[PDB]
Design a protein around this nucleic acid. Sequence first.
RNA 1: GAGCUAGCCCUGGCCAGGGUGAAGCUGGGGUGAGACCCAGUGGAGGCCCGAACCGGUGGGGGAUGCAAACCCCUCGGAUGA
RNA 2: GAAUGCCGGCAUGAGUAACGAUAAAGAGGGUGAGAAUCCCUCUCGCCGUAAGCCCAAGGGUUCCUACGCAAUGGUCGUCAGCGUAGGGUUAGGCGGGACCUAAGGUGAAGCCGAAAGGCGUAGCCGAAGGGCAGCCGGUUAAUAUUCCGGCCCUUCCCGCAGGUGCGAUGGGGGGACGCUCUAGGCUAGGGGGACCGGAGCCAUGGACGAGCCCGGCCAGAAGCGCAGGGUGGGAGGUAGGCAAAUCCGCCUCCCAACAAGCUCUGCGUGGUGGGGAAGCCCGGGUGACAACCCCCCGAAGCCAGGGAGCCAAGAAAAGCCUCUAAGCACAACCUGCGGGAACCCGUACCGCAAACCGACACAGGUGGGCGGGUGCAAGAGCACUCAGGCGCGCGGGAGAACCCUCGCCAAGGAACUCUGCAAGUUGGCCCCGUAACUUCGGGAGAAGGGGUGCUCCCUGGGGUGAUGAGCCCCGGGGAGCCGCAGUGAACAGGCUCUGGCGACUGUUUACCAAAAACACAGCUCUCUGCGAACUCGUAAGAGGAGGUAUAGGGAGCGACGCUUGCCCGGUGCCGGAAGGUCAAGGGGAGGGGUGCAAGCCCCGAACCGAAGCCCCGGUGAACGGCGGCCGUAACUAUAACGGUCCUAAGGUAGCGAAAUUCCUUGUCGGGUAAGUUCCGACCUGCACGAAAAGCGUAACGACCGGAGCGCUGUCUCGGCGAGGGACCCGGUGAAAUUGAACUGGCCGUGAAGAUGCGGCCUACCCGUGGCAGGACGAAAAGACCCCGUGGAGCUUUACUGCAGCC
RNA 3: CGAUGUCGGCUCGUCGCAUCCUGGGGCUGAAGAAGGUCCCAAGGGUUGGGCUGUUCGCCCAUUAAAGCGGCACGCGAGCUG
RNA 4: UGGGAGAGGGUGGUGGAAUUCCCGGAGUAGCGGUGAAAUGCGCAGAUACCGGGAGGAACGCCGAUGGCGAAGGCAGCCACCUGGUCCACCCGUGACGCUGAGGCGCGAAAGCGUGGGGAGCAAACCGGAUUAGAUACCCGGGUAGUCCACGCCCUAAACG
RNA 5: CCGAGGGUAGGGCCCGUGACUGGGGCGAAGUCGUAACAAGGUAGCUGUACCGGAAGGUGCGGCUGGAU
RNA 6: GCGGGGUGGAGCAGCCUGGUAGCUCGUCGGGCUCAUAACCCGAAGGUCGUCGGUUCAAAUCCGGCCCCCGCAACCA
Lengths: 48, 275
Amino acid sequence: MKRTWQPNRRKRAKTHGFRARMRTPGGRKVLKRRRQKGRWRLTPAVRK
Amino acid sequence: AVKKFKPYTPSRRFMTVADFSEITKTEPEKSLVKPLKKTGGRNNQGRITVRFRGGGHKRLYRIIDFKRWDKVGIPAKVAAIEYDPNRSARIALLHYVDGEKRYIIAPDGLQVGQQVVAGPDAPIQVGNALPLRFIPVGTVVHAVELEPKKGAKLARAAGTSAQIQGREGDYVILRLPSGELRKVHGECYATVGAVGNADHKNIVLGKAGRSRWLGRRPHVRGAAMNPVDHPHGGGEGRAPRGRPPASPWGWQTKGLKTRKRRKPSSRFIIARRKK
RNA sequence: GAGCUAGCCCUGGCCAGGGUGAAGCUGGGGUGAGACCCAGUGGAGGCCCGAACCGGUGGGGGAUGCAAACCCCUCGGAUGA
RNA sequence: GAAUGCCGGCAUGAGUAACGAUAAAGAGGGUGAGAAUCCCUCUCGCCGUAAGCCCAAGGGUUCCUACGCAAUGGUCGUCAGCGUAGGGUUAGGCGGGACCUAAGGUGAAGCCGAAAGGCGUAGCCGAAGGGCAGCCGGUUAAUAUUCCGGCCCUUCCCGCAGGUGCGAUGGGGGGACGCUCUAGGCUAGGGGGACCGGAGCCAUGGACGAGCCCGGCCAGAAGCGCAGGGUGGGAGGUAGGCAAAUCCGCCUCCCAACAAGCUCUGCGUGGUGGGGAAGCCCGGGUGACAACCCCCCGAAGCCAGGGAGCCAAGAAAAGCCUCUAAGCACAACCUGCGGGAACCCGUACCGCAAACCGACACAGGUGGGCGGGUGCAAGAGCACUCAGGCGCGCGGGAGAACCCUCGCCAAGGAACUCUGCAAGUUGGCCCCGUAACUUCGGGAGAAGGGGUGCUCCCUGGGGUGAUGAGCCCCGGGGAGCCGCAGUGAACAGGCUCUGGCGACUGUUUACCAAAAACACAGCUCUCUGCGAACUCGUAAGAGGAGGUAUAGGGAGCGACGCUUGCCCGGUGCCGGAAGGUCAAGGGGAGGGGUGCAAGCCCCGAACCGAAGCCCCGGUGAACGGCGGCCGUAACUAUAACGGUCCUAAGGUAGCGAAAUUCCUUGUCGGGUAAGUUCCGACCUGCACGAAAAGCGUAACGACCGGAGCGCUGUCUCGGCGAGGGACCCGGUGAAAUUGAACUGGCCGUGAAGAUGCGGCCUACCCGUGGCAGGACGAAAAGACCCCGUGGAGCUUUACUGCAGCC
RNA sequence: CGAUGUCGGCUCGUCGCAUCCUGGGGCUGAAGAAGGUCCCAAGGGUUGGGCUGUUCGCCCAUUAAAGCGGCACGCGAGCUG
RNA sequence: UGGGAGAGGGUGGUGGAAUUCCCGGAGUAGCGGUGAAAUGCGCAGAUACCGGGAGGAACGCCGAUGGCGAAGGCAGCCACCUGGUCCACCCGUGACGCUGAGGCGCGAAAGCGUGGGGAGCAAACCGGAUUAGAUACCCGGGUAGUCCACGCCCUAAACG
RNA sequence: CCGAGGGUAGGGCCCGUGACUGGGGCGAAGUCGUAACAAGGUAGCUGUACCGGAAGGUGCGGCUGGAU
RNA sequence: GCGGGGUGGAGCAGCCUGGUAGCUCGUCGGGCUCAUAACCCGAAGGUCGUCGGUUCAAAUCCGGCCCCCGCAACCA
Ligand SMILES: NC[C@H]1O[C@H](O[C@H]2[C@H](O)[C@@H](O[C@H]3O[C@H](CO)[C@@H](O)[C@H](N)[C@H]3O)[C@H](N)C[C@@H]2N)[C@H](O)[C@@H](O)[C@@H]1O
Ligand SMILES: [Mg+2]
Ligand SMILES: [Mg+2]
Ligand SMILES: [Mg+2]
Ligand SMILES: [Mg+2]
Ligand SMILES: [Mg+2]
Ligand SMILES: [Mg+2]
Ligand SMILES: [Mg+2]
Ligand SMILES: [Mg+2]
Ligand SMILES: [Mg+2]
Ligand SMILES: [Mg+2]
Ligand SMILES: [Mg+2]
Ligand SMILES: [Mg+2]
Ligand SMILES: [Mg+2]
Ligand SMILES: [Mg+2]
Ligand SMILES: [Mg+2]
Ligand SMILES: [Mg+2]
Ligand SMILES: [Mg+2]
Ligand SMILES: [Mg+2]
Ligand SMILES: [Mg+2]
Ligand SMILES: [Mg+2]
Ligand SMILES: [Mg+2]
Ligand SMILES: [Mg+2]
Ligand SMILES: [Mg+2]
Ligand SMILES: [Mg+2]
Ligand SMILES: [Mg+2]
Ligand SMILES: [Mg+2]
Ligand SMILES: [Mg+2]
Ligand SMILES: [Mg+2]
Ligand SMILES: [Mg+2]
Ligand SMILES: [Mg+2]
Ligand SMILES: [Mg+2]
Ligand SMILES: [Mg+2]
Ligand SMILES: [Mg+2]
Ligand SMILES: [Mg+2]
Ligand SMILES: [Mg+2]
Ligand SMILES: [Mg+2]
Ligand SMILES: [Mg+2]
Ligand SMILES: [Mg+2]
Ligand SMILES: [Mg+2]
Ligand SMILES: [Mg+2]
Ligand SMILES: [Mg+2]
Ligand SMILES: [Mg+2]
Ligand SMILES: [Mg+2]
Ligand SMILES: [Mg+2]
Ligand SMILES: [Mg+2]
Ligand SMILES: [Mg+2]
Ligand SMILES: [Mg+2]
Ligand SMILES: [Mg+2]
Ligand SMILES: [Mg+2]
Ligand SMILES: [Mg+2]
Ligand SMILES: [Mg+2]
Ligand SMILES: [Mg+2]
Ligand SMILES: [Mg+2]
Ligand SMILES: [Mg+2]
Ligand SMILES: [Mg+2]
Ligand SMILES: [Mg+2]
Ligand SMILES: [Mg+2]
Ligand SMILES: [Mg+2]
Ligand SMILES: [Mg+2]
Ligand SMILES: [Mg+2]
Ligand SMILES: [Mg+2]
Ligand SMILES: [Mg+2]
Ligand SMILES: [Mg+2]
Ligand SMILES: [Mg+2]
Ligand SMILES: [Mg+2]
Ligand SMILES: [Mg+2]
Ligand SMILES: [Mg+2]
Ligand SMILES: [Mg+2]
Ligand SMILES: [Mg+2]
Ligand SMILES: [Mg+2]
Ligand SMILES: [Mg+2]
Ligand SMILES: [Mg+2]
Ligand SMILES: [Mg+2]
Ligand SMILES: [Mg+2]
Ligand SMILES: [Mg+2]
Ligand SMILES: [Mg+2]
Ligand SMILES: [Mg+2]
Ligand SMILES: [Mg+2]
Ligand SMILES: [Mg+2]
Ligand SMILES: [Mg+2]
Ligand SMILES: [Mg+2]
Ligand SMILES: [Mg+2]
Ligand SMILES: [Mg+2]
Ligand SMILES: [Mg+2]
Ligand SMILES: [Mg+2]
Ligand SMILES: [Mg+2]
Ligand SMILES: [Mg+2]
Ligand SMILES: [Mg+2]
Ligand SMILES: [Mg+2]
Ligand SMILES: [Mg+2]
Ligand SMILES: [Mg+2]
Ligand SMILES: [Mg+2]
Ligand SMILES: [Mg+2]
Ligand SMILES: [Mg+2]
Ligand SMILES: [Mg+2]
Ligand SMILES: [Mg+2]
Ligand SMILES: [Mg+2]
Ligand SMILES: [Mg+2]
Ligand SMILES: [Mg+2]
Ligand SMILES: [Mg+2]
Ligand SMILES: [Mg+2]
Ligand SMILES: [Mg+2]
Ligand SMILES: [Mg+2]
Ligand SMILES: [Mg+2]
Ligand SMILES: [Mg+2]
Ligand SMILES: [Mg+2]
Ligand SMILES: [Mg+2]
Ligand SMILES: [Mg+2]
Ligand SMILES: [Mg+2]
Ligand SMILES: [Mg+2]
Ligand SMILES: [Mg+2]
Ligand SMILES: [Mg+2]
Ligand SMILES: [Mg+2]
Ligand SMILES: [Mg+2]
Ligand SMILES: [Mg+2]
Ligand SMILES: [Mg+2]
Ligand SMILES: [Mg+2]
Ligand SMILES: [Mg+2]
Ligand SMILES: [Mg+2]
Ligand SMILES: [Mg+2]
Ligand SMILES: [Mg+2]
Ligand SMILES: [Mg+2]
Ligand SMILES: [Mg+2]
Ligand SMILES: [Mg+2]
Ligand SMILES: [Mg+2]
Ligand SMILES: [Mg+2]
Ligand SMILES: [Mg+2]
Ligand SMILES: [Mg+2]
Ligand SMILES: [Mg+2]
Ligand SMILES: [Mg+2]
Ligand SMILES: [Mg+2]
Ligand SMILES: [Mg+2]
Ligand SMILES: [Mg+2]
Ligand SMILES: [Mg+2]
Ligand SMILES: [Mg+2]
Ligand SMILES: [Mg+2]
Ligand SMILES: [Mg+2]
Ligand SMILES: [Mg+2]
Ligand SMILES: [Mg+2]
Ligand SMILES: [Mg+2]
Ligand SMILES: [Mg+2]
Ligand SMILES: [Mg+2]
Ligand SMILES: [Mg+2]
Ligand SMILES: [Mg+2]
Ligand SMILES: [Mg+2]
Ligand SMILES: [Mg+2]
Ligand SMILES: [Mg+2]
Ligand SMILES: [Mg+2]
Ligand SMILES: [Mg+2]
Ligand SMILES: [Mg+2]
Ligand SMILES: [Mg+2]
Ligand SMILES: [Mg+2]
Ligand SMILES: [Mg+2]
Ligand SMILES: [Mg+2]
Ligand SMILES: [Mg+2]
Ligand SMILES: [Mg+2]
Ligand SMILES: [Mg+2]
Ligand SMILES: [Mg+2]
Ligand SMILES: [Mg+2]
Ligand SMILES: [Mg+2]
Ligand SMILES: [Mg+2]
Ligand SMILES: [Mg+2]
Ligand SMILES: [Mg+2]
Ligand SMILES: [Mg+2]
Ligand SMILES: [Mg+2]
Ligand SMILES: [Mg+2]
Ligand SMILES: [Mg+2]
Ligand SMILES: [Mg+2]
Ligand SMILES: [Mg+2]
Ligand SMILES: [Mg+2]
Ligand SMILES: [Mg+2]
Ligand SMILES: [Mg+2]
Ligand SMILES: [Mg+2]
Ligand SMILES: [Mg+2]
Ligand SMILES: [Mg+2]
Ligand SMILES: [Mg+2]
Ligand SMILES: [Mg+2]
Ligand SMILES: [Mg+2]
Ligand SMILES: [Mg+2]
Ligand SMILES: [Mg+2]
Ligand SMILES: [Mg+2]
Ligand SMILES: [Mg+2]
Ligand SMILES: [Mg+2]
Ligand SMILES: [Mg+2]
Ligand SMILES: [Mg+2]
Ligand SMILES: [Mg+2]
Ligand SMILES: [Mg+2]
Ligand SMILES: [Mg+2]
Ligand SMILES: [Mg+2]
Ligand SMILES: [Mg+2]
Ligand SMILES: [Mg+2]
Ligand SMILES: [Mg+2]
Ligand SMILES: [Mg+2]
Ligand SMILES: [Mg+2]
Ligand SMILES: [Mg+2]
Ligand SMILES: [Mg+2]
Ligand SMILES: [Mg+2]
Ligand SMILES: [Mg+2]
Ligand SMILES: [Mg+2]
Ligand SMILES: [Mg+2]
Ligand SMILES: [Mg+2]
Ligand SMILES: [Mg+2]
Ligand SMILES: [Mg+2]
Ligand SMILES: [Mg+2]
Ligand SMILES: [Mg+2]
Ligand SMILES: [Mg+2]
Ligand SMILES: [Mg+2]
Ligand SMILES: [Mg+2]
Ligand SMILES: [Mg+2]
Ligand SMILES: [Mg+2]
Ligand SMILES: [Mg+2]
Ligand SMILES: [Mg+2]
Ligand SMILES: [Mg+2]
Ligand SMILES: [Mg+2]
Ligand SMILES: [Mg+2]
Ligand SMILES: [Mg+2]
Ligand SMILES: [Mg+2]
Ligand SMILES: [Mg+2]
Ligand SMILES: [Mg+2]
Ligand SMILES: [Mg+2]
Ligand SMILES: [Mg+2]
Ligand SMILES: [Mg+2]
């Protein structure tokens, strides 16, 4: 049947993107937390 | 006078639609329509704040003129009578000798091609609008402002009307469609006559789908839910109310008055509504 | 976290073919005028049959599966909520 | 040494299951160390509304080529979506941006919030919607509306000519709209041709033929032709379109109206440019100066913003046209022509799938377009088939039990069983015919029947054309032929009677329930006078609703028919300016502490003092409730009648052994040979009953009962056959499980059900195919039950709070 | 209780005998025939239906007879549900 | 042709008396009801009185033993639309008449449907008396209905 | 070809019978009340509606076939 | 198993809180009436289910026994 992952570059970028993050106190704390851990990518790569 | 259908389907048995006989123009005046943002019952938070709404026909809002004192003394011809999906009543297209075009909700009997006019010295004729203080006592009237220069708020539904019962100082005493006796200010405008399309209540929707076209999503009973959802939720098998009948939010719904007690307008209501 | 799912919003698209024959309109009969009746035209409907499409009724298989809900046979809707 | 411990390694099951749709394979020739598996040929089969082709999304080099075979590939591998390397994606016109708006998002102003932040007019963002200029062919191993060729076009800048009151983010028009049905004329597409072109073919008994086979086009500016669409002209007045306005709107007057004129699209044609088959020969060459014509069918597409009907009444903004305003009229704009200018991103490949979502080269999921032919009434159905694409990445044998999918069956025909579950039967079209009942629609495809092919003959109407031929489409009559059989294959209702529930089409427990449940039109109660009630929110703000009592909220009942009785004492709700009670506050009789004292400080009765409660009324489609005992009639029996106790009042109509009846398979009747179910009755209704509605009800139902006919492998009762497995061989090779094991039967014993103890009995060692009695077999730290002063959901006149409201 | 799957049906049986039938007997209020009652006897046999989930039971039509019990109310790594 | 009487019918208006309710005043201990009473209402201020308002229904005197219509039936007043009828004159047509199975139309009241309306009255129903009982007569309440529009029903001691 | 009739399927009328059920007629001396005849002790009858063990009662309108 | 009950002939008070048995109907005697019912005037009948106990004293308070309604009998 239909599964749960239906990839969508726009959805992915407008939901977990860098700018979606910075617009929100909880989203900037994500980037902070992910930077502090040393995440190579702070955010999903999506090709556009 | 409503129109029946033969029982060629189960739902055509009782379905009745309006006869649309008073209608003369079958497409709206482009200069006076705007898009009607469909809400679906949701508010700016995105939340349903009126249950069971959405999914009805697309409509264009027809801009209705409720402050007829905007053009005192300028007669207008009644050009057409059109169908408005945003109200039970019909609407009349007015060509003013100004050249300006406006809609008003059509009173009962108004004929296309009569001059209508609004103002203190206007005739006491169906369709004319006057300050309440100049309409003779006993005259039925509609599109009544509730406060001066604030817009017609009362008597706008098909077949409704309000009767002038008497004057008292700066205020006239109106009997609203509910039968309430209210003091409305004499400078409030009102269009003489009753609103038309009185057969509007005699329409039998006929089937579930017709309720859906009107934008009315299906309505589920408290008794059909679980206690999580409703005071009347749950129970093994069916069940009476088991407590005084109540709304989903707990407050009682058989008799409990909800008008704010200390409302300032209480000073101006004379008799609460009948029946 | 509504890229699954549920409701709404905006904007598009899809529904082979066949059947039934409402109102109306026309003609004729009828009457004081009517109601009405007959034919023809007409083409209404949460109308019928049935693919796509949407379902998931019964049974069988499958059960370390082809599949963490599938396969086959049968069945519901298919201009509409 | 144990923790169903943790990490890792290696065992067992085992050379066992399995190797992923039963569409299908065989041979020959290549290559190579090696070939069922790679390449070529021939034969065979499978898809063909796809299993073919083109987009979009997503994927991200998977594309092409060379060289490779460790791993990946369920086997093999020389092959590959794999390893290495090189190559490959070309645009003013296609898509997106430098244009526009939609929901929504954001947001100068403004509002709100302890902080974070929440709103919000304009404006901005935002597309698969609006607007905007490219068609056909050739070329590469790999890109092509992108390169090239041909013929077209757009916008910007600059100049020239002519014209004009030029000029806008401002005014106005327009853009601009639904559903169903649908006319005329075309195009896409397709069928035919005894006409035109073509390498050839004559077989195996006949055919040198009006023979077979193949092909008979594509695009194209101006002009022209056909069919459509859009559109009145003038004048005067003018107070509206938030300035102006010659525009628009409104009024008036003259002429013009199925026209004409002007303008716009479609199709046709069109200079010109292309393409061009089978067959043969090695992707190409030929064919070939290829031919390129006639007729028919014909859209759902086009003309289009066409027409009619209907109600549920059907985006916005820009481009565009027009009006003017500042300004300016050396301007500026409009038109025609010319030269110049024209940027950024995408473009490979997969794309119903081995490249996307499913951990997999996974029988599942994935939106749009094209989807040919013939026959079957039609069709995107069904069978076969073109183009094109595949034979599903283990094979070879064998022909056991057993399993799956399928075929047939003597006699019987539901005897099977919880149940006709399953499987038969029925099945398309045309014609005859068709009951109770009904809300007059229906029930109805009721039921039940007859017909159905091929050939000859005669004949009626349509469409095209021309009125004719030809083509094509509907028919009517007659005479015949063959078979077991003519919807000869494939797709394609079994029917009837009778109950229960629900009116009905719909909805639901994604993944054990599709129902009698939810919803539903319809009925009633109730709240709401609009800054409505109600809902979300601390608020601002929203929804309600740009609605106004014929409206909006809440609740119950649930089409329709006939109806819906009695009780207001208790609870709720509504009404009640008295009385009772009542907190803060007012009041301050009267006390108290301290000081030399003025004073300071404390306590404090009467009395005044809201809502709420008490109290008085009302109120049932508000929560709800609607009795007991005893007696009585001239046979008996039964009690119309009576007595009394109690209640707020004692169940009315109608129904009743029922989705309700415990005793119960009640009793009687029907149906059967036989009926715990079924239907009809009776009524001592354990324990129906009137909007948690009562009783009915045509029609509807993948609901649940009962019966009958048809028909059958369901069964008496089983037999045979097919293919896929199971078995054997070669290749690959799992799993849960497992204290160790050298693991028998009985009768006893034992923590009470022993391979393991005792006694006896039996028994050479090791396998393979099979069956499931045992290993209290596996799986899951029992989901029942109990325990735990463990937890969670729900309720209430449990406690205590809080929101809200007063 | 770190699981001994719980009714009935179906299939497959096997054992007990307190014997339903069949074989052998004694007593009889056994004339015969046919019964009654007890004893011995487990070799074999012990039907097909209607009803209900039913075991059981009642009923139909037969029969030599339509036996009763145990095997985890025998048997779900055998099926049903 | 010219005249006349009439509650004949339909539509739209509209006038006063009265009952009820509501608001204001004034006012106090009962009112109401009956055969007599009780229920009921009343110090939360009833009854009686005055001013104001809302609303429905029926039209007093005229009124008669009267008038009109086919019957059912029709009564404040006004206007419109319309039916029948009688009288005079003796003008026209020239038997064109009578009756009437079926048909069609009208048809008091109650009753039904859909809206509206609702003061008084009042089946049902509740209560109070009476009563052996009193599912009645009497009293206090009281819902359909009585009223309007449209559509039905079509009955009668629809009688002279 | 037609054809007695046989068969399959579906209708229509009539008759007999049926658990049970409705009212009806009749039958010396059973039970309850007393509706009507007198103003029958509420004048009666009436069409209709609702109610009640039963006659009946009540509403609405009608009749005199009503007494005084 | 838990709850309530048994009293003139019928149906009910009195039991709690020990001394006293009461209400309606019925029954019997009388009246009225032509007569019956109604109505009026008088009166009779209950040792309180039964045995035991407490007590000065028991319908009453406490036990047992008898009978009669009511509620309950759930989890498999
Ligand atoms: N037992 C047997 C007798 O029974 C009937 O007689 C009885 C009547 O039926 C009763 O009459 C009642 O019923 C009638 C029906 O209308 C009413 O008129 C009348 N008012 C009523 O009183 C009357 N009460 C008693 C009488 N013995 C028969 O007729 C009689 O032949 C037979 O011998
Ligand atoms: Mg699926
Ligand atoms: Mg996943
Ligand atoms: Mg997707
Ligand atoms: Mg999305
Ligand atoms: Mg910060
Ligand atoms: Mg934070
Ligand atoms: Mg119709
Ligand atoms: Mg209208
Ligand atoms: Mg518009
Ligand atoms: Mg505009
Ligand atoms: Mg918002
Ligand atoms: Mg938000
Ligand atoms: Mg003032
Ligand atoms: Mg209605
Ligand atoms: Mg309605
Ligand atoms: Mg609804
Ligand atoms: Mg609703
Ligand atoms: Mg509902
Ligand atoms: Mg539920
Ligand atoms: Mg929740
Ligand atoms: Mg709640
Ligand atoms: Mg709750
Ligand atoms: Mg409840
Ligand atoms: Mg429930
Ligand atoms: Mg229940
Ligand atoms: Mg979604
Ligand atoms: Mg979803
Ligand atoms: Mg349909
Ligand atoms: Mg299925
Ligand atoms: Mg599904
Ligand atoms: Mg299901
Ligand atoms: Mg199965
Ligand atoms: Mg099947
Ligand atoms: Mg099925
Ligand atoms: Mg269908
Ligand atoms: Mg383990
Ligand atoms: Mg383990
Ligand atoms: Mg580990
Ligand atoms: Mg091994
Ligand atoms: Mg093994
Ligand atoms: Mg496998
Ligand atoms: Mg495979
Ligand atoms: Mg295969
Ligand atoms: Mg060779
Ligand atoms: Mg070689
Ligand atoms: Mg070699
Ligand atoms: Mg095809
Ligand atoms: Mg393919
Ligand atoms: Mg493919
Ligand atoms: Mg895209
Ligand atoms: Mg990938
Ligand atoms: Mg390899
Ligand atoms: Mg290798
Ligand atoms: Mg390999
Ligand atoms: Mg924009
Ligand atoms: Mg914001
Ligand atoms: Mg776009
Ligand atoms: Mg473009
Ligand atoms: Mg091309
Ligand atoms: Mg090369
Ligand atoms: Mg190309
Ligand atoms: Mg200009
Ligand atoms: Mg529509
Ligand atoms: Mg074209
Ligand atoms: Mg030729
Ligand atoms: Mg020959
Ligand atoms: Mg030749
Ligand atoms: Mg001018
Ligand atoms: Mg204006
Ligand atoms: Mg202006
Ligand atoms: Mg202005
Ligand atoms: Mg202006
Ligand atoms: Mg022209
Ligand atoms: Mg022109
Ligand atoms: Mg050549
Ligand atoms: Mg199309
Ligand atoms: Mg198409
Ligand atoms: Mg299409
Ligand atoms: Mg740039
Ligand atoms: Mg490309
Ligand atoms: Mg593909
Ligand atoms: Mg697709
Ligand atoms: Mg692929
Ligand atoms: Mg993969
Ligand atoms: Mg594969
Ligand atoms: Mg796949
Ligand atoms: Mg197609
Ligand atoms: Mg054929
Ligand atoms: Mg090919
Ligand atoms: Mg391929
Ligand atoms: Mg295969
Ligand atoms: Mg073998
Ligand atoms: Mg072999
Ligand atoms: Mg096997
Ligand atoms: Mg057979
Ligand atoms: Mg048979
Ligand atoms: Mg059964
Ligand atoms: Mg059955
Ligand atoms: Mg079946
Ligand atoms: Mg029919
Ligand atoms: Mg048929
Ligand atoms: Mg039927
Ligand atoms: Mg043939
Ligand atoms: Mg022609
Ligand atoms: Mg079918
Ligand atoms: Mg039943
Ligand atoms: Mg249903
Ligand atoms: Mg259906
Ligand atoms: Mg489910
Ligand atoms: Mg689920
Ligand atoms: Mg699940
Ligand atoms: Mg699950
Ligand atoms: Mg789930
Ligand atoms: Mg269903
Ligand atoms: Mg209803
Ligand atoms: Mg809130
Ligand atoms: Mg709030
Ligand atoms: Mg607010
Ligand atoms: Mg709004
Ligand atoms: Mg409403
Ligand atoms: Mg009926
Ligand atoms: Mg009562
Ligand atoms: Mg009550
Ligand atoms: Mg009360
Ligand atoms: Mg109360
Ligand atoms: Mg009370
Ligand atoms: Mg306090
Ligand atoms: Mg206080
Ligand atoms: Mg006080
Ligand atoms: Mg108070
Ligand atoms: Mg009270
Ligand atoms: Mg209720
Ligand atoms: Mg007796
Ligand atoms: Mg009595
Ligand atoms: Mg009471
Ligand atoms: Mg009952
Ligand atoms: Mg009752
Ligand atoms: Mg029973
Ligand atoms: Mg019964
Ligand atoms: Mg019951
Ligand atoms: Mg029955
Ligand atoms: Mg109820
Ligand atoms: Mg009916
Ligand atoms: Mg169903
Ligand atoms: Mg049953
Ligand atoms: Mg049943
Ligand atoms: Mg059959
Ligand atoms: Mg078989
Ligand atoms: Mg085989
Ligand atoms: Mg032992
Ligand atoms: Mg032992
Ligand atoms: Mg043992
Ligand atoms: Mg072997
Ligand atoms: Mg075993
Ligand atoms: Mg445990
Ligand atoms: Mg349990
Ligand atoms: Mg438990
Ligand atoms: Mg505790
Ligand atoms: Mg706890
Ligand atoms: Mg256990
Ligand atoms: Mg068992
Ligand atoms: Mg069997
Ligand atoms: Mg024995
Ligand atoms: Mg012998
Ligand atoms: Mg002897
Ligand atoms: Mg003897
Ligand atoms: Mg013998
Ligand atoms: Mg033996
Ligand atoms: Mg039994
Ligand atoms: Mg037994
Ligand atoms: Mg029995
Ligand atoms: Mg014998
Ligand atoms: Mg046992
Ligand atoms: Mg057992
Ligand atoms: Mg099992
Ligand atoms: Mg079992
Ligand atoms: Mg005259
Ligand atoms: Mg006159
Ligand atoms: Mg006082
Ligand atoms: Mg009259
Ligand atoms: Mg004279
Ligand atoms: Mg004379
Ligand atoms: Mg004469
Ligand atoms: Mg003559
Ligand atoms: Mg003469
Ligand atoms: Mg007649
Ligand atoms: Mg009448
Ligand atoms: Mg009437
Ligand atoms: Mg009715
Ligand atoms: Mg008395
Ligand atoms: Mg009585
Ligand atoms: Mg009564
Ligand atoms: Mg009564
Ligand atoms: Mg008379
Ligand atoms: Mg014959
Ligand atoms: Mg014969
Ligand atoms: Mg014969
Ligand atoms: Mg006698
Ligand atoms: Mg007697
Ligand atoms: Mg009487
Ligand atoms: Mg009498
Ligand atoms: Mg009388
Ligand atoms: Mg008399
Ligand atoms: Mg009564
Ligand atoms: Mg009765
Ligand atoms: Mg009685
Ligand atoms: Mg009675
Ligand atoms: Mg009465
Ligand atoms: Mg009369
Ligand atoms: Mg006694
Ligand atoms: Mg007694
Ligand atoms: Mg006592
Ligand atoms: Mg006496
Ligand atoms: Mg008396
Ligand atoms: Mg005694
Ligand atoms: Mg005693
Ligand atoms: Mg004694
Ligand atoms: Mg003593
Ligand atoms: Mg004693
Ligand atoms: Mg005693
Ligand atoms: Mg005793
Ligand atoms: Mg149990």
